[PDB]
Amino acid sequence: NFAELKIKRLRKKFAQKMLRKARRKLIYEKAKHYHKEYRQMYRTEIRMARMARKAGNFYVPAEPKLAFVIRIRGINGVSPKVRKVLQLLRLRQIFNGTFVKLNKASINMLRIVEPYIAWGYPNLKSVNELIYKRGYGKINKKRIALTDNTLIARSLGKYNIICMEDLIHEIYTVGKHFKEANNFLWPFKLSSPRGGMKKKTTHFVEGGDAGNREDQINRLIRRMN
Amino acid sequence: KGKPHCSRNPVLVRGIGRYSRSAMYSRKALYKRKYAALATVTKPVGGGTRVVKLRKMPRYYPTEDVPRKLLSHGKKPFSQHVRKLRASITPGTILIILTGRHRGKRVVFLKQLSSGLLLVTGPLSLNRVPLRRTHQKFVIATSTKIDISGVKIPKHLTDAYFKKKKKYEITEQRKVDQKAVDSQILPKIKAVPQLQGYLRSVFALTNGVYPHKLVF
């Protein structure tokens, strides 16, 4: 028989194909909306600074909410407290990197381990490149390279993150589920900095590489990835 | 049925079209293009008729066999590879053969062949080289050119013509083709003063001159 079963097979196939097409359109429109939002955010600071200058006052921009941290010292001879903080920040290997959202706890935690890390405020392009090139997902306690959107969609579907654009937007804007997104994100393994470092041991202010560099972390990332 | 129209968008960049999805939906006029829903042969025998089965089963299977291969897409046979040519090489340019039996002989270049090899010849009347093929990598292209846009070379010569056979005897067809090409090439190079002697000479490196310094 199966005169109906055979057509039902392809009916199910067509339904699945239409569902996939709808999902693709959804993520495409969401990416377009994210691009619009990024442009709006970029122009808003310029507008506010311009109006403040025109009025003669000053416009202090909001303190950055997202930071990128790279471990720049080895495993040998580490104080136990610094070792514990590095373990908590998930920097167990030299030239590992991760994103950290900022608050009092994060500030003090980073201050404890200033000599061992170089951290700064990542740029949108830096986030994009880091996610696309070095970004691997932690699925089933396994380091899986993110080569398809379904891998992201399963691990973060309940948080309405369904593709690379959602992941990047949520990381860059520090969304409500930034903790879940960042934890799903495996720590980045960056190559050695092409062109060399200035001086690993000392602080960035005194001509070294350790400590906080506000926006030079983007210059560092460009050569470390 | 239906004559195959050309693509409606010029290639902006490789893999990216000039017009978007909606512009294409308009240009294709798809708003009015909606659509909706062997192995046996009978033969006579002198008995009766026999249903002979072509594609019969093999009479020997090997002890063991290798499995199939996984499928790959970007790999194409050498026949349909895209052919590249250096910018400095144009018809009528002087080349310096670097690796053949004709080491360092200045030779006039005529045409790019189908498999990528250069069809080259300096009239063997003066520098002693016939119609020949040469890989574009193994030649130095100097910046001296003659005008051969107004010469005709036979269409019958090709890679199948120049393919090696099997003592090698030159054929009368080879001789007549060489004469036909050189009878037009030679007057062109004789117009330029001191060019025949230049082609007769042989390139060489003496002490104190270095290729990265000297220009050609």
Binding site: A15, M18, A22, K25, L26 | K34, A36, A37
Partner: peptide, 19 residues
């Protein structure tokens, strides 16, 4: 529409409309 459950009828609608 992209929701597998509530978007089934809308998906059917657009699929039939394409015809």
């Amino acid at each position: 529409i992209a929701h597998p459950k509530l978007g089934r009828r809308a998906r059917a609608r657009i699929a039939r409309g394409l015809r």
